[PDB]
């Protein structure tokens, strides 16, 4: 009756912080025996819940949101934290209870040819509401028209590459991050153990 956390974390296909990936866990026994107890976890921290109580806590549903960001930007995934990734890309609430985990994927997702497949968000018109998927293909602007008919000025594309390549230092090594949010709204709990 074990949850699919295994796959979730080991699928090694993580897409992007741009239009992140989600999963709604339900109908399982949340073991946790491996969670925050596996060996290669680098950083784990939850707000609102203690780890052992967590191992004994029980809930109605779970939301996991995995993505990949640059190591120097992990400090921006935090309650109400302000920056770029946390203001225009993906913003977690202020009273968010749950924990995040981050791995230095300095080998798994990188290529000498440039593992820049993912394009993070660097141009947004207005700050994000918490958990607002804003995957879009538009041209952010300054002049009248967008780049379809203009060039140079007002020809911006919000999806900018990362350029992950091995010479990059630690501060620029792709960290894979996963955030857990436990919802408790009036419903029978299908996740406890």
């Amino acid at each position: 009756n074990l949850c699919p956390f295994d796959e979730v974390f080991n699928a090694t296909r993580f897409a992007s912080v741009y239009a992140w990936n989600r999963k709604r866990i339900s109908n399982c026994v949340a073991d946790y025996s491996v969670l925050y107890n596996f060996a290669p976890f680098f950083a784990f921290k939850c707000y609102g819940v203690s780890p052992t109580k967590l191992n004994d806590l029980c809930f109605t549903n779970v939301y996991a949101d995995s993505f990949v960001i640059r190591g120097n930007e992990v400090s921006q995934i935090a309650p109400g934290q302000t920056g770029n990734i946390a203001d225009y890309n993906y913003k977690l609430p202020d009273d968010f209870t749950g924990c995040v985990i981050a791995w230095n994927s300095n080998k798994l997702d990188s290529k000498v040819g440039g593992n820049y497949n993912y394009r993070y968000r660097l141009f947004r018109k207005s700050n994000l509401k918490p958990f607002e998927r804003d995957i879009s293909t538009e041209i952010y602007q300054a002049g009248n028209k967008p780049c379809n008919g203009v060039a140079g000025v007002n020809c911006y594309f919000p999806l900018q590459s990362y350029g992950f390549r091995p010479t990059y230092g630690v501060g620029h090594q792709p960290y894979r991050v996963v955030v857990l949010s436990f919802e408790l709204l009036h419903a029978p709990a299908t996740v406890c153990g």
Partner: antibody
Amino acid sequence: EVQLVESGGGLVQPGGSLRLSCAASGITVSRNYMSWVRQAPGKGLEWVSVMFAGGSTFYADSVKGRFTISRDNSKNTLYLQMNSLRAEDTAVYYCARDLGVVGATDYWGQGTLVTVSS
Amino acid sequence: ERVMTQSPATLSVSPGERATLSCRASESVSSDLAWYQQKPGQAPRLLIYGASTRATGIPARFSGSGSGTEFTLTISSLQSEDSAVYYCQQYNNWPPGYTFGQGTKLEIK
């Protein structure tokens, strides 16, 4: 033409306050990453402050806690309020629109001298 | 906070020849750079961003090179008005960040 014009430069006694203003043309500011730079006479340059297109601002450490950036979106202009000017801050301040990886800082302002009484 | 150091301080080359300016970083900077030419009397002017991409309009006479922690700017044929100060600006942390250099003084004869 696209330009940034500045005002507020002058002289004020130390510890006093001042307010720098920046007007733009042919380009929007509300949706443009703004960055105020300054230059001491004869020395290099240093990033002073930045305001984003959503409002979340940031400041350098040397001036943290003393300067506050704001912008009158209604008439397409930027502003920087200063306080507690000490002996270092005598410098010329520039207004810039910085894009970053997609084109580094380009459009700059004529500048404004800021010296103190003594 | 990567500290950039320019070199040499001064350079005097006969008109019509090449000119070489080095700017040295302390960390890794990959291809995050730019070059500014601040003709004496007004604000600087952007010449070449990223690694070597020539800003719009900027005469082809300029050429940038280098990567990692070391970069170089090269001018094909200096005309009389090329005399100015030049600065290498890094931006490895863009929101919010930049770090300037000490500048270089270039003259003619």
